[model samples]
Target: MAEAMDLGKDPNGPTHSSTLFVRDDGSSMSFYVRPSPAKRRLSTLILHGGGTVCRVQEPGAVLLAQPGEALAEASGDFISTQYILDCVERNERLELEAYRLGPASAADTGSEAK
Candidate 1:
């Protein structure tokens, strides 16, 4: 169950956290937070998308989510890429690797994994 939040100024304005909200489907939607006074910060809540929710410096917290997704995708890509390299080294008939599938790759150089 989720609690009612008091975002007084923007109750429904935005979400803040580095974690995703788990849907019953087993997949999850990202949860986000817009920066507020550091002292007024919300308590940490455990959520989906890697199991822990996090916060980002605001005013464009949602935009941050895009990179979070990219980080995951790129990480998975690198992991898959490494696996392929490993397999090829082991003489597997075929090897497979995943690459970041779109423009965000070029844009996310600093944050995305190789």
Candidate 2:
């Protein structure tokens, strides 16, 4: 019985394809998807892919809106959030600068451009 008790855990690390369903709240909520492009009065939970919904709040919470409204005006400690469709349409995690929603953002200091 000592042998059975001693043998536990694989020697490898782990990862889930979509933003893993985590036990740690600080582990980050993947997305907070709403209904009818957030038109109707309801919520959604995409098992193994997303999380809770409550008017878009949380650092890692991705907002789910079709049209471009109520995106950058968040009330949480967000890196920022936008339409989830844009995320999938591009089929990748876009840089924070892309969705900043501005035409002429800034002047560069170190970037080399022509």
Candidate 3:
């Protein structure tokens, strides 16, 4: 599961690609696993609802990083550097860090409490 509401970037470029999808509420809801020709691509997460969407990118997701850092501050495990690195390595195509959509995010659940 994922939590938080910001975007992240691959410190190491090649291994990971990133992108974002933004909704009107200044909140990010979901992440996409794909590279985008555009510097930033906004997307939507139909399942999570709350108009939860993300602004995506390739090799980096800045929007996701914004809320991700905030969530990380509030909760240490919201975003893990190790996890982020692993995700880039695991998915050769593209990787998306789940934005910390605040404590209210339904997506925020599992062994790693957000």
Candidate 4:
């Protein structure tokens, strides 16, 4: 896990953290997002380095984002699901996976890879 930091705040709202990292592959980069205070109705439009929009894997689902494509009007809460975007190949491809971050026991976390 990477160091957790505040990405600054909006006008009168909570701060947010948007992070990018290299997966175990060592060549590809991955990203994660969360609000400082964890809002209920979260929505965002994700764009990549070249200003390309990421696409969602499922219609009406705000869970996944694909590289070089656009994820438009995605909405989800941070309490249950966390969205992680990863580079598949260079900047031409990407993958997004939703991880369950809800309450769990130590034993459960130990058994889970993510």
Candidate 5:
């Protein structure tokens, strides 16, 4: 069982894809996501819904997981949080990743004309 979230895109053109999972502790929740697009070389995790100020920290460097591969993990404390989606349950495991692309190249800009 797996769930996906649309994290929107960064102004720099990287897309974030997330997978929901129940925390191992079973009291709160956890997730593994690729916070970048499909060509970039970095990613991290972001937590929200605790207070007025959400925390934005880099868990670590992560790569996209394969269909049958395992995902990076992080646990949180909360019986219930707004971040938890209705479709996700407790103790579920999933994987995701992020990537990026080069800023508009000459080929894309069509600026190589003679």
Candidate 6:
């Protein structure tokens, strides 16, 4: 007998597109976590935390990114469950720079690379 609560606002949630796994553009953001035993884990995090998941190939779909090497090869926004928990605690969307899929060369080079 479960149904929507519709409480109008959650002090625990910043809510909507600003939430994790929802792109700034309103598409479902991707988690590069493979079967590293994290794909579905984070999928459930965002899903339960008030977001949706979709196939990576869907049009307008965006991928998560970061400059910590392996997950930074691509270009896009980024974050992870570790960050999500922080957001939930703060009730704020953490700024993504530290977690964004940035220029690995830049992050590795400290912006002095011309």
Best-fitting candidate, measured by TM-score?
A: 6
Between candidates 4 and 5, the one scoring higher on TM-score is 4
Per-model tally of clashing residue pairs? 7, 0, 28, 7, 9, 2
TM-score of candidate 4 to 2 decimals? 0.19
lDDT of 2 by residue, 24-57 (tens): 4535344444444443322432243243454554
TM-scores, all candidates, are: 0.21, 0.29, 0.20, 0.19, 0.17, 0.44
- List the candidate 5 regions with Cα displacement exceeding 4 Å: 1-54, 61-91, 98-114
Candidate 6, lDDT over the whole model? 0.49
- List per-prediction Cα lDDT, in the order shown: 0.30, 0.39, 0.33, 0.29, 0.27, 0.49
Q: Could you tell me how far off, in angstroms, the CA of residue 59 lies in candidate 2 after the best superposition?
A: 5.8
Better of 1 and 4 by lDDT: 1
lDDT of 4 by residue, 1-114 (tens): 689776965557222222122333433322233332322222331232212121333222333212222333234321222332222122223333333333234453332122
Candidate scoring better on lDDT of 2 and 3: 2
The candidate 6 region of ten consecutive residues with least summed lDDT is 105-114
**Sorted by lDDT, highest first, which candidate order results?**
6, 2, 3, 1, 4, 5
**Root-mean-square deviation per candidate:** 18.5, 10.9, 17.3, 16.0, 20.9, 10.4
Candidate 3 minimal-lDDT segment of 10 residues: 39-48
Instruction: Looking at model 2, report the run of 10 residues with the lowest lDDT sum.
Output: 40-49
The 10-residue segment of model 4 with minimum total lDDT is 45-54
TM-score of 2: 0.29
5-104, model 5: which lDDT tens digit per residue?
8897655722322333323454323223333352121112323211111223223322222222232222321121212332233222332221211122
Give a tens-digit lDDT track for model 3, residues 2-25.
888988874764433342222445
Better of 1 and 5 by lDDT: 1
- Which candidate order results from sorting by TM-score in descending order? 6, 2, 1, 3, 4, 5
Top-lDDT candidate index: 6
lDDT of 4 at 64: 29
lDDT of 1: 0.30
